[PDB]
mmCIF file of C-alpha atoms in Angstrom:
data_model
loop_
_atom_site.group_PDB
_atom_site.id
_atom_site.type_symbol
_atom_site.label_atom_id
_atom_site.label_comp_id
_atom_site.label_asym_id
_atom_site.label_seq_id
_atom_site.Cartn_x
_atom_site.Cartn_y
_atom_site.Cartn_z
ATOM 1 C CA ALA V 1 -73.163 7.914 47.256
ATOM 2 C CA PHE V 2 -74.008 11.118 48.442
ATOM 3 C CA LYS V 3 -77.630 11.539 50.691
ATOM 4 C CA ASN V 4 -77.391 15.290 50.499
ATOM 5 C CA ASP V 5 -75.574 18.663 49.308
ATOM 6 C CA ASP V 6 -73.818 19.003 52.906
ATOM 7 C CA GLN V 7 -72.489 15.861 52.052
ATOM 8 C CA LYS V 8 -71.774 15.890 48.258
ATOM 9 C CA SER V 9 -70.319 19.671 48.368
ATOM 10 C CA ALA V 10 -68.223 18.891 51.508
ATOM 11 C CA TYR V 11 -66.526 15.887 49.381
ATOM 12 C CA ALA V 12 -65.973 18.056 46.833
ATOM 13 C CA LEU V 13 -64.665 20.697 48.761
ATOM 14 C CA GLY V 14 -61.971 18.086 50.302
ATOM 15 C CA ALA V 15 -61.255 16.318 47.028
ATOM 16 C CA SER V 16 -60.518 19.788 45.633
ATOM 17 C CA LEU V 17 -57.678 20.263 48.758
ATOM 18 C CA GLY V 18 -56.450 17.074 48.170
ATOM 19 C CA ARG V 19 -55.960 17.533 44.386
ATOM 20 C CA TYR V 20 -54.361 20.943 45.138
ATOM 21 C CA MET V 21 -52.016 18.809 47.486
ATOM 22 C CA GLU V 22 -51.338 16.467 44.622
ATOM 23 C CA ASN V 23 -50.150 19.033 42.233
ATOM 24 C CA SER V 24 -47.688 20.588 45.101
ATOM 25 C CA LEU V 25 -46.252 17.711 45.539
ATOM 26 C CA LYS V 26 -45.699 17.752 41.852
ATOM 27 C CA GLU V 27 -44.027 20.849 41.346
ATOM 28 C CA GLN V 28 -41.893 19.971 44.616
ATOM 29 C CA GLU V 29 -40.592 16.858 43.062
ATOM 30 C CA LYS V 30 -39.417 18.818 39.877
ATOM 31 C CA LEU V 31 -36.891 20.419 42.448
ATOM 32 C CA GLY V 32 -35.974 16.845 44.142
ATOM 33 C CA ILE V 33 -38.004 17.739 47.194
ATOM 34 C CA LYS V 34 -39.632 14.867 48.495
ATOM 35 C CA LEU V 35 -42.382 15.489 51.440
ATOM 36 C CA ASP V 36 -43.305 12.943 53.582
ATOM 37 C CA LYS V 37 -46.992 12.364 52.300
ATOM 38 C CA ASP V 38 -48.356 10.779 55.622
ATOM 39 C CA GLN V 39 -47.354 13.589 57.388
ATOM 40 C CA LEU V 40 -48.880 15.871 54.713
ATOM 41 C CA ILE V 41 -52.146 14.149 55.346
ATOM 42 C CA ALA V 42 -51.866 13.809 59.487
ATOM 43 C CA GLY V 43 -51.546 17.850 59.657
ATOM 44 C CA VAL V 44 -54.362 18.098 57.527
ATOM 45 C CA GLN V 45 -56.500 15.600 59.464
ATOM 46 C CA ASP V 46 -55.223 17.016 62.806
ATOM 47 C CA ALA V 47 -55.636 20.852 62.069
ATOM 48 C CA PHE V 48 -59.051 19.837 61.160
ATOM 49 C CA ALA V 49 -59.904 18.458 64.318
ATOM 50 C CA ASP V 50 -58.065 21.049 66.213
ATOM 51 C CA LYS V 51 -55.129 18.981 67.415
ATOM 52 C CA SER V 52 -52.225 20.125 65.596
ATOM 53 C CA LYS V 53 -49.006 19.253 66.979
ATOM 54 C CA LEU V 54 -47.382 22.237 66.312
ATOM 55 C CA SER V 55 -48.001 25.618 67.441
ATOM 56 C CA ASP V 56 -48.718 28.850 65.031
ATOM 57 C CA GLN V 57 -45.730 30.176 65.760
ATOM 58 C CA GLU V 58 -43.840 27.002 64.842
ATOM 59 C CA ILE V 59 -46.400 26.283 61.511
ATOM 60 C CA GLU V 60 -45.274 29.974 60.284
ATOM 61 C CA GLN V 61 -41.872 29.467 61.203
ATOM 62 C CA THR V 62 -41.774 26.386 59.310
ATOM 63 C CA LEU V 63 -43.479 27.291 55.934
ATOM 64 C CA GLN V 64 -41.314 30.312 55.949
ATOM 65 C CA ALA V 65 -38.204 28.240 56.225
ATOM 66 C CA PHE V 66 -39.747 25.669 53.657
ATOM 67 C CA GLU V 67 -41.230 28.090 51.126
ATOM 68 C CA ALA V 68 -37.262 29.793 50.694
ATOM 69 C CA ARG V 69 -36.062 26.219 50.399
ATOM 70 C CA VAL V 70 -38.324 25.751 47.115
ATOM 71 C CA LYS V 71 -37.801 29.237 45.821
ATOM 72 C CA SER V 72 -33.836 28.864 46.187
ATOM 73 C CA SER V 73 -34.192 25.326 44.509
ATOM 74 C CA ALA V 74 -36.565 26.749 41.963
ATOM 75 C CA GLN V 75 -33.885 29.468 41.239
ATOM 76 C CA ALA V 76 -30.882 27.323 40.801
ATOM 77 C CA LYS V 77 -32.618 24.627 38.625
ATOM 78 C CA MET V 78 -34.024 27.888 36.376
ATOM 79 C CA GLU V 79 -30.704 29.335 36.338
ATOM 80 C CA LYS V 80 -29.126 25.941 35.498
ATOM 81 C CA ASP V 81 -31.858 25.158 32.529
ATOM 82 C CA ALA V 82 -31.623 28.360 31.045
ATOM 83 C CA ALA V 83 -28.189 28.302 30.727
ATOM 84 C CA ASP V 84 -27.795 24.369 29.821
ATOM 85 C CA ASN V 85 -30.507 24.963 26.925
ATOM 86 C CA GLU V 86 -29.079 28.187 25.571
ATOM 87 C CA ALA V 87 -25.685 26.352 24.906
ATOM 88 C CA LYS V 88 -27.592 22.866 23.887
ATOM 89 C CA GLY V 89 -29.233 24.666 21.502
ATOM 90 C CA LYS V 90 -26.840 26.724 19.815
ATOM 91 C CA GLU V 91 -24.933 23.340 19.303
ATOM 92 C CA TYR V 92 -28.165 21.607 18.091
ATOM 93 C CA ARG V 93 -29.146 24.465 15.598
ATOM 94 C CA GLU V 94 -24.994 24.936 14.178
ATOM 95 C CA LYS V 95 -25.236 21.782 13.190
ATOM 96 C CA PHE V 96 -28.486 21.197 12.039
ATOM 97 C CA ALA V 97 -27.739 24.402 9.895
ATOM 98 C CA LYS V 98 -24.746 22.752 7.654
ATOM 99 C CA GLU V 99 -26.930 20.065 6.475
ATOM 100 C CA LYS V 100 -28.141 19.737 2.772
ATOM 101 C CA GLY V 101 -31.013 21.917 2.116
ATOM 102 C CA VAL V 102 -30.855 23.935 5.169
ATOM 103 C CA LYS V 103 -30.748 27.473 5.434
ATOM 104 C CA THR V 104 -30.169 30.424 8.288
ATOM 105 C CA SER V 105 -31.796 33.487 7.905
ATOM 106 C CA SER V 106 -30.788 37.185 8.874
ATOM 107 C CA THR V 107 -32.748 36.442 12.266
ATOM 108 C CA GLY V 108 -30.852 33.441 13.351
ATOM 109 C CA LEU V 109 -33.812 31.099 12.469
ATOM 110 C CA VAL V 110 -32.684 27.848 10.810
ATOM 111 C CA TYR V 111 -35.393 26.097 8.294
ATOM 112 C CA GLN V 112 -35.616 23.402 6.159
ATOM 113 C CA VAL V 113 -38.298 24.198 3.222
ATOM 114 C CA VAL V 114 -39.894 20.177 2.587
ATOM 115 C CA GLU V 115 -42.432 21.531 0.095
ATOM 116 C CA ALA V 116 -42.793 24.843 -1.273
ATOM 117 C CA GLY V 117 -46.182 24.587 -2.271
ATOM 118 C CA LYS V 118 -47.938 26.694 -4.336
ATOM 119 C CA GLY V 119 -49.836 30.022 -4.065
ATOM 120 C CA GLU V 120 -50.105 33.495 -2.628
ATOM 121 C CA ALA V 121 -46.707 34.752 -0.209
ATOM 122 C CA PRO V 122 -47.961 34.217 3.154
ATOM 123 C CA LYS V 123 -48.090 37.906 5.046
ATOM 124 C CA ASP V 124 -48.621 39.104 8.825
ATOM 125 C CA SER V 125 -52.107 39.665 8.285
ATOM 126 C CA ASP V 126 -53.224 36.200 6.986
ATOM 127 C CA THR V 127 -55.057 33.578 8.735
ATOM 128 C CA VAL V 128 -52.687 30.252 7.914
ATOM 129 C CA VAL V 129 -54.087 27.216 8.383
ATOM 130 C CA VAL V 130 -51.638 24.146 9.570
ATOM 131 C CA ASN V 131 -51.342 20.793 10.836
ATOM 132 C CA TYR V 132 -47.668 20.651 12.990
ATOM 133 C CA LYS V 133 -45.450 18.892 15.655
ATOM 134 C CA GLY V 134 -43.422 20.470 18.119
ATOM 135 C CA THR V 135 -40.449 18.891 20.107
ATOM 136 C CA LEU V 136 -37.850 20.243 21.821
ATOM 137 C CA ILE V 137 -34.287 18.891 21.005
ATOM 138 C CA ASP V 138 -34.211 15.581 22.930
ATOM 139 C CA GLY V 139 -37.361 14.608 21.215
ATOM 140 C CA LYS V 140 -39.816 15.426 23.668
ATOM 141 C CA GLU V 141 -43.391 16.451 22.157
ATOM 142 C CA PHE V 142 -45.034 19.597 23.724
ATOM 143 C CA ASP V 143 -47.145 20.282 21.217
ATOM 144 C CA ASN V 144 -49.109 18.470 18.489
ATOM 145 C CA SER V 145 -52.241 19.298 16.529
ATOM 146 C CA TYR V 146 -52.667 16.083 15.176
ATOM 147 C CA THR V 147 -53.793 15.030 18.989
ATOM 148 C CA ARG V 148 -56.565 17.723 19.002
ATOM 149 C CA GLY V 149 -57.757 16.138 15.825
ATOM 150 C CA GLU V 150 -57.672 19.664 13.971
ATOM 151 C CA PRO V 151 -55.656 22.044 11.992
ATOM 152 C CA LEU V 152 -54.742 24.978 13.941
ATOM 153 C CA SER V 153 -56.108 28.056 12.282
ATOM 154 C CA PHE V 154 -54.307 31.817 13.176
ATOM 155 C CA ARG V 155 -53.313 34.847 12.345
ATOM 156 C CA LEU V 156 -49.751 34.850 11.187
ATOM 157 C CA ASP V 157 -48.625 37.603 13.242
ATOM 158 C CA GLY V 158 -50.192 36.034 16.284
ATOM 159 C CA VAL V 159 -47.873 33.556 17.081
ATOM 160 C CA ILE V 160 -44.128 33.760 17.759
ATOM 161 C CA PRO V 161 -41.405 35.545 15.743
ATOM 162 C CA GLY V 162 -40.100 32.349 14.554
ATOM 163 C CA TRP V 163 -43.278 30.811 13.129
ATOM 164 C CA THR V 164 -44.524 34.531 11.855
ATOM 165 C CA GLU V 165 -41.114 34.430 9.867
ATOM 166 C CA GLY V 166 -40.862 30.929 8.897
ATOM 167 C CA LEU V 167 -44.251 30.208 7.362
ATOM 168 C CA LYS V 168 -43.226 32.836 4.541
ATOM 169 C CA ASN V 169 -40.847 30.639 3.210
ATOM 170 C CA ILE V 170 -43.534 28.225 1.635
ATOM 171 C CA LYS V 171 -47.097 28.859 0.056
ATOM 172 C CA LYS V 172 -50.246 26.704 0.456
ATOM 173 C CA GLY V 173 -49.668 23.054 0.075
ATOM 174 C CA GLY V 174 -45.957 23.415 1.700
ATOM 175 C CA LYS V 175 -44.189 22.219 4.258
ATOM 176 C CA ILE V 176 -41.224 23.495 6.123
ATOM 177 C CA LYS V 177 -38.967 22.473 9.120
ATOM 178 C CA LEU V 178 -38.276 24.921 11.480
ATOM 179 C CA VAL V 179 -35.832 25.108 14.203
ATOM 180 C CA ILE V 180 -36.279 28.214 16.161
ATOM 181 C CA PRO V 181 -34.051 29.795 18.962
ATOM 182 C CA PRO V 182 -35.277 31.067 22.111
ATOM 183 C CA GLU V 183 -35.153 34.134 21.151
ATOM 184 C CA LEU V 184 -37.530 33.931 18.420
ATOM 185 C CA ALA V 185 -39.672 31.378 20.578
ATOM 186 C CA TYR V 186 -40.408 31.639 24.589
ATOM 187 C CA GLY V 187 -36.625 32.891 25.980
ATOM 188 C CA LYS V 188 -35.626 32.478 29.141
ATOM 189 C CA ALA V 189 -38.977 32.467 30.535
ATOM 190 C CA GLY V 190 -40.324 29.953 28.415
ATOM 191 C CA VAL V 191 -43.984 28.761 29.221
ATOM 192 C CA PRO V 192 -45.765 25.378 30.609
ATOM 193 C CA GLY V 193 -43.819 22.686 28.682
ATOM 194 C CA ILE V 194 -41.149 24.515 27.305
ATOM 195 C CA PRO V 195 -38.139 25.148 29.720
ATOM 196 C CA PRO V 196 -36.385 28.088 29.449
ATOM 197 C CA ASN V 197 -33.911 29.299 26.697
ATOM 198 C CA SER V 198 -35.583 26.168 24.534
ATOM 199 C CA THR V 199 -34.649 25.510 21.201
ATOM 200 C CA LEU V 200 -37.749 24.570 19.261
ATOM 201 C CA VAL V 201 -38.339 21.871 16.650
ATOM 202 C CA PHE V 202 -41.492 22.413 14.587
ATOM 203 C CA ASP V 203 -42.463 20.287 11.361
ATOM 204 C CA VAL V 204 -45.293 22.209 9.659
ATOM 205 C CA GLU V 205 -48.010 21.566 6.883
ATOM 206 C CA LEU V 206 -49.341 24.939 5.790
ATOM 207 C CA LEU V 207 -52.875 23.520 4.475
ATOM 208 C CA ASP V 208 -54.335 26.656 3.705
ATOM 209 C CA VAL V 209 -53.661 30.740 3.281
ATOM 210 C CA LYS V 210 -56.629 33.115 3.395
ATOM 211 C CA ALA N 1 -41.661 13.883 66.611
ATOM 212 C CA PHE N 2 -40.491 15.415 63.936
ATOM 213 C CA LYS N 3 -37.409 13.790 62.483
ATOM 214 C CA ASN N 4 -36.500 15.910 59.808
ATOM 215 C CA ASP N 5 -37.795 18.531 57.622
ATOM 216 C CA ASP N 6 -39.124 16.588 55.315
ATOM 217 C CA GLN N 7 -41.576 15.257 58.069
ATOM 218 C CA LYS N 8 -41.564 18.605 59.671
ATOM 219 C CA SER N 9 -42.391 21.164 56.967
ATOM 220 C CA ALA N 10 -45.000 18.590 55.321
ATOM 221 C CA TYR N 11 -46.969 18.522 58.614
ATOM 222 C CA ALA N 12 -46.931 22.439 58.997
ATOM 223 C CA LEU N 13 -47.911 22.382 55.428
ATOM 224 C CA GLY N 14 -51.060 19.863 56.070
ATOM 225 C CA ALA N 15 -52.004 22.199 59.195
ATOM 226 C CA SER N 16 -51.958 25.378 57.501
ATOM 227 C CA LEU N 17 -53.953 23.884 54.949
ATOM 228 C CA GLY N 18 -56.520 22.013 57.345
ATOM 229 C CA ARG N 19 -56.960 25.136 59.140
ATOM 230 C CA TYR N 20 -57.481 27.116 56.092
ATOM 231 C CA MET N 21 -60.305 24.952 55.517
ATOM 232 C CA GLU N 22 -61.868 25.057 58.936
ATOM 233 C CA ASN N 23 -61.698 28.729 58.768
ATOM 234 C CA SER N 24 -63.472 28.590 55.389
ATOM 235 C CA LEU N 25 -66.019 26.156 56.954
ATOM 236 C CA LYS N 26 -66.171 28.631 60.125
ATOM 237 C CA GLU N 27 -67.426 31.106 57.528
ATOM 238 C CA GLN N 28 -69.769 29.152 55.910
ATOM 239 C CA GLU N 29 -71.414 28.263 59.569
ATOM 240 C CA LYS N 30 -72.404 31.826 59.992
ATOM 241 C CA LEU N 31 -74.436 31.806 57.213
ATOM 242 C CA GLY N 32 -76.142 28.527 57.916
ATOM 243 C CA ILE N 33 -74.403 26.008 56.054
ATOM 244 C CA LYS N 34 -72.561 23.294 57.912
ATOM 245 C CA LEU N 35 -70.974 20.823 55.638
ATOM 246 C CA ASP N 36 -70.200 17.345 56.928
ATOM 247 C CA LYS N 37 -66.748 17.397 58.037
ATOM 248 C CA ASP N 38 -66.393 13.267 57.588
ATOM 249 C CA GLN N 39 -67.033 13.900 53.653
ATOM 250 C CA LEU N 40 -64.866 16.566 53.730
ATOM 251 C CA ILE N 41 -61.842 14.650 55.077
ATOM 252 C CA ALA N 42 -62.752 11.346 52.724
ATOM 253 C CA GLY N 43 -62.948 13.717 49.825
ATOM 254 C CA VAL N 44 -59.216 14.894 50.684
ATOM 255 C CA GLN N 45 -57.857 11.398 51.420
ATOM 256 C CA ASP N 46 -59.487 9.632 48.371
ATOM 257 C CA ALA N 47 -58.098 12.469 45.927
ATOM 258 C CA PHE N 48 -55.410 12.298 47.426
ATOM 259 C CA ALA N 49 -54.927 8.695 46.530
ATOM 260 C CA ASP N 50 -56.337 9.548 43.084
ATOM 261 C CA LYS N 51 -59.708 7.625 43.802
ATOM 262 C CA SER N 52 -61.879 10.646 43.842
ATOM 263 C CA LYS N 53 -65.607 9.725 43.599
ATOM 264 C CA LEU N 54 -65.973 12.767 41.917
ATOM 265 C CA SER N 55 -64.254 13.324 38.464
ATOM 266 C CA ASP N 56 -62.314 16.611 37.853
ATOM 267 C CA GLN N 57 -65.654 17.610 36.009
ATOM 268 C CA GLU N 58 -67.819 16.607 38.776
ATOM 269 C CA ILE N 59 -66.165 18.342 41.575
ATOM 270 C CA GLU N 60 -66.331 21.468 39.427
ATOM 271 C CA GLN N 61 -70.029 21.402 38.810
ATOM 272 C CA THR N 62 -70.487 20.683 42.277
ATOM 273 C CA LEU N 63 -68.361 23.351 43.675
ATOM 274 C CA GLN N 64 -69.999 25.731 41.011
ATOM 275 C CA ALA N 65 -73.381 25.151 42.512
ATOM 276 C CA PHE N 66 -71.807 25.174 46.105
ATOM 277 C CA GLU N 67 -70.596 28.984 45.498
ATOM 278 C CA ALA N 68 -74.341 29.853 43.984
ATOM 279 C CA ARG N 69 -75.721 27.827 47.592
ATOM 280 C CA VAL N 70 -73.124 30.334 49.303
ATOM 281 C CA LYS N 71 -74.074 33.449 48.104
ATOM 282 C CA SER N 72 -77.784 32.898 48.150
ATOM 283 C CA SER N 73 -77.438 32.205 51.887
ATOM 284 C CA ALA N 74 -74.983 35.597 52.531
ATOM 285 C CA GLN N 75 -78.154 37.307 50.948
ATOM 286 C CA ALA N 76 -80.663 35.486 53.256
ATOM 287 C CA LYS N 77 -78.568 36.199 56.084
ATOM 288 C CA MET N 78 -78.702 39.948 54.990
ATOM 289 C CA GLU N 79 -82.303 40.251 54.525
ATOM 290 C CA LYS N 80 -82.689 38.634 58.116
ATOM 291 C CA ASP N 81 -80.449 40.899 59.898
ATOM 292 C CA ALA N 82 -82.094 43.617 58.266
ATOM 293 C CA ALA N 83 -85.073 42.853 59.447
ATOM 294 C CA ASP N 84 -84.483 41.977 62.897
ATOM 295 C CA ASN N 85 -82.475 45.209 63.252
ATOM 296 C CA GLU N 86 -85.064 47.110 62.083
ATOM 297 C CA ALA N 87 -87.344 45.661 64.783
ATOM 298 C CA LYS N 88 -85.157 45.683 67.549
ATOM 299 C CA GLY N 89 -84.137 49.371 66.755
ATOM 300 C CA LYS N 90 -87.484 50.618 66.326
ATOM 301 C CA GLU N 91 -88.180 49.412 69.678
ATOM 302 C CA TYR N 92 -84.959 50.829 71.046
ATOM 303 C CA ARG N 93 -85.753 54.186 69.631
ATOM 304 C CA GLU N 94 -89.706 54.085 70.809
ATOM 305 C CA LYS N 95 -88.684 53.529 74.524
ATOM 306 C CA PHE N 96 -85.908 56.096 74.605
ATOM 307 C CA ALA N 97 -88.328 58.793 73.053
ATOM 308 C CA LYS N 98 -90.729 58.387 75.724
ATOM 309 C CA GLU N 99 -88.248 59.236 78.657
ATOM 310 C CA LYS N 100 -87.775 62.781 79.926
ATOM 311 C CA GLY N 101 -85.892 65.214 78.055
ATOM 312 C CA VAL N 102 -86.083 62.948 75.049
ATOM 313 C CA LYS N 103 -87.436 64.640 71.326
ATOM 314 C CA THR N 104 -88.450 63.059 68.317
ATOM 315 C CA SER N 105 -88.510 65.048 64.840
ATOM 316 C CA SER N 106 -90.431 65.178 62.167
ATOM 317 C CA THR N 107 -88.208 63.150 60.211
ATOM 318 C CA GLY N 108 -87.897 60.334 63.142
ATOM 319 C CA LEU N 109 -84.572 61.592 64.503
ATOM 320 C CA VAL N 110 -84.552 60.846 68.129
ATOM 321 C CA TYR N 111 -82.279 63.377 70.392
ATOM 322 C CA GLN N 112 -82.001 64.643 73.706
ATOM 323 C CA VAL N 113 -80.202 67.937 74.290
ATOM 324 C CA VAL N 114 -77.945 67.650 77.636
ATOM 325 C CA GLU N 115 -76.269 71.017 77.103
ATOM 326 C CA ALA N 116 -77.782 73.708 74.651
ATOM 327 C CA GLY N 117 -74.524 75.383 74.179
ATOM 328 C CA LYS N 118 -74.087 79.244 73.268
ATOM 329 C CA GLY N 119 -73.819 81.144 69.558
ATOM 330 C CA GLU N 120 -75.003 80.694 66.540
ATOM 331 C CA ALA N 121 -77.039 77.447 65.182
ATOM 332 C CA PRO N 122 -75.080 75.333 62.935
ATOM 333 C CA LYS N 123 -76.345 75.632 58.739
ATOM 334 C CA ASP N 124 -75.856 73.608 55.913
ATOM 335 C CA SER N 125 -72.711 74.816 54.811
ATOM 336 C CA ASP N 126 -70.990 75.031 57.735
ATOM 337 C CA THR N 127 -68.129 73.164 59.063
ATOM 338 C CA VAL N 128 -68.532 71.710 62.360
ATOM 339 C CA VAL N 129 -65.981 70.245 64.574
ATOM 340 C CA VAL N 130 -67.209 67.890 67.042
ATOM 341 C CA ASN N 131 -65.960 64.900 69.866
ATOM 342 C CA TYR N 132 -68.159 62.017 69.470
ATOM 343 C CA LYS N 133 -68.794 58.194 70.654
ATOM 344 C CA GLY N 134 -70.717 55.974 68.236
ATOM 345 C CA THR N 135 -72.460 53.037 69.214
ATOM 346 C CA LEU N 136 -74.568 50.557 68.127
ATOM 347 C CA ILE N 137 -77.980 49.808 70.123
ATOM 348 C CA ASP N 138 -76.645 46.738 71.948
ATOM 349 C CA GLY N 139 -73.568 48.993 73.359
ATOM 350 C CA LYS N 140 -70.807 48.032 70.795
ATOM 351 C CA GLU N 141 -69.026 51.503 69.947
ATOM 352 C CA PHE N 142 -68.144 51.828 66.188
ATOM 353 C CA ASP N 143 -66.564 54.535 66.508
ATOM 354 C CA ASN N 144 -64.680 57.339 69.277
ATOM 355 C CA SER N 145 -63.401 60.337 68.322
ATOM 356 C CA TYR N 146 -61.671 61.106 71.434
ATOM 357 C CA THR N 147 -59.881 57.682 70.884
ATOM 358 C CA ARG N 148 -58.077 59.658 67.773
ATOM 359 C CA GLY N 149 -57.171 62.365 70.054
ATOM 360 C CA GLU N 150 -58.558 64.804 68.255
ATOM 361 C CA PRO N 151 -62.102 66.031 67.296
ATOM 362 C CA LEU N 152 -63.609 65.346 63.781
ATOM 363 C CA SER N 153 -64.274 68.021 61.681
ATOM 364 C CA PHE N 154 -66.789 68.034 58.672
ATOM 365 C CA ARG N 155 -69.093 69.958 56.512
ATOM 366 C CA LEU N 156 -72.617 69.793 58.448
ATOM 367 C CA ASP N 157 -74.554 68.638 55.280
ATOM 368 C CA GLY N 158 -71.482 66.398 53.758
ATOM 369 C CA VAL N 159 -72.275 63.810 56.704
ATOM 370 C CA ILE N 160 -75.937 61.023 57.226
ATOM 371 C CA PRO N 161 -78.896 63.159 57.682
ATOM 372 C CA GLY N 162 -79.060 62.288 60.805
ATOM 373 C CA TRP N 163 -75.860 64.262 61.725
ATOM 374 C CA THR N 164 -76.757 66.964 59.737
ATOM 375 C CA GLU N 165 -80.445 67.764 61.604
ATOM 376 C CA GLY N 166 -79.445 66.626 64.772
ATOM 377 C CA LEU N 167 -76.589 68.887 65.187
ATOM 378 C CA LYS N 168 -78.727 71.805 64.330
ATOM 379 C CA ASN N 169 -80.454 71.379 67.993
ATOM 380 C CA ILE N 170 -78.019 73.065 69.691
ATOM 381 C CA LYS N 171 -74.988 75.619 69.329
ATOM 382 C CA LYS N 172 -71.134 76.005 69.868
ATOM 383 C CA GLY N 173 -70.259 74.369 73.062
ATOM 384 C CA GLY N 174 -73.129 72.055 73.421
ATOM 385 C CA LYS N 175 -73.806 68.558 73.859
ATOM 386 C CA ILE N 176 -76.473 66.225 72.401
ATOM 387 C CA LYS N 177 -77.462 62.267 72.239
ATOM 388 C CA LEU N 178 -78.542 61.615 68.917
ATOM 389 C CA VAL N 179 -80.612 58.395 68.271
ATOM 390 C CA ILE N 180 -80.612 57.827 64.304
ATOM 391 C CA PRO N 181 -83.213 55.145 62.518
ATOM 392 C CA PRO N 182 -81.342 53.623 59.723
ATOM 393 C CA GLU N 183 -83.096 55.760 57.244
ATOM 394 C CA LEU N 184 -81.192 58.858 58.380
ATOM 395 C CA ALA N 185 -77.952 56.881 58.572
ATOM 396 C CA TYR N 186 -76.646 53.617 56.353
ATOM 397 C CA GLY N 187 -79.916 52.262 55.799
ATOM 398 C CA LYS N 188 -80.183 48.214 54.796
ATOM 399 C CA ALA N 189 -76.825 48.170 53.457
ATOM 400 C CA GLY N 190 -75.096 49.527 56.402
ATOM 401 C CA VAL N 191 -71.483 49.839 56.139
ATOM 402 C CA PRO N 192 -68.234 48.092 57.803
ATOM 403 C CA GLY N 193 -69.171 47.753 61.503
ATOM 404 C CA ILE N 194 -72.125 48.881 61.281
ATOM 405 C CA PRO N 195 -75.038 45.921 60.053
ATOM 406 C CA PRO N 196 -77.988 46.366 57.892
ATOM 407 C CA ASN N 197 -80.733 48.560 59.406
ATOM 408 C CA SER N 198 -78.565 49.672 62.632
ATOM 409 C CA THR N 199 -80.034 52.222 64.513
ATOM 410 C CA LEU N 200 -77.223 54.386 65.868
ATOM 411 C CA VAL N 201 -76.463 56.065 68.935
ATOM 412 C CA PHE N 202 -73.899 59.009 69.281
ATOM 413 C CA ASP N 203 -73.005 61.306 72.233
ATOM 414 C CA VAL N 204 -71.909 64.591 70.749
ATOM 415 C CA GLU N 205 -70.103 67.262 71.934
ATOM 416 C CA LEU N 206 -70.236 69.927 69.661
ATOM 417 C CA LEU N 207 -66.742 72.149 69.765
ATOM 418 C CA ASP N 208 -66.980 74.772 67.169
ATOM 419 C CA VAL N 209 -69.197 76.175 64.269
ATOM 420 C CA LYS N 210 -67.270 77.840 61.279
#
């Protein structure tokens, strides 16, 4: 496959560039931007052979415009998503909060104790051990301890406020459903996997409190 | 022949990336590392098509090993340049030192008084004001006060030893050429613009001693 390092390392370096481009295409697709892949590859090949069809100024200006197009799109989408998610989330929480056995805390956390459990009331400095599933209001799973094959262990004050607050509502052996406003979660910015202003739905099983 | 932005921007993006890659190989080349360009393009193509002959894990392992090769090669080049420059400089100094009017000091500084000047001899805690031009033995100018439109002012013992010692051989109004061994200058490490073990040539005019 590879005779020596000048080959293998080259190939690796190249594959890394190829991977980078694919990743870039993926973020662009989120914005409806679908670049011409053949042209993307040809520019790489041409440049690499010192035969670019575009002058240095043209490249620079073209990229400048492109990067502005991308950022402009990205911002409008963030703006729209944020507004839409805040609204849909409020509606969702409002409806759920009315259901049998569901409660709303003074902070806006909405929760449903499924099993109370038994033992000490969890406190901020405790280590809790849990199984859990996290999904968005449309059902999209973004996190899931089961898939890693072990429960998550963490300091109660080391997670999002909705968790820090919610788990205090049960004890060891308990189970609770938490419907958390973005204000007690990842807010407007969100994080990878979690869009701006997302209400999060967690199904949690509290296995240990130590 | 670009018909639209999705074609043109993709090409520019690829070209920018290919140029980045080409420039990287150029730097590697300066260290004796000449990767196989055909394999580099095959890696780009294969990865872009999700058919890389190296898994992500293998790519990373290969690249980490490559980074260490690169740094090892960088250090090798330094050592070689350090040795070569020490030899060339010693040769330059020895020849110059035999010429009429040139002296060698106890420390190995080589110097040529052009004009004695008149007044007090510069002492360690004094401030000196000088015009000078600094060249490597091959003639490459690395510093030239005249171009700054003003002389340089400094405490005599706050600079490289070659200057500290050298300027004591003339007086205000004098001029001296200093041929300074690396040991009395920036030594094996050098500094930006001055390679390892560079003998330095300074044409100096001593304007004031205060």
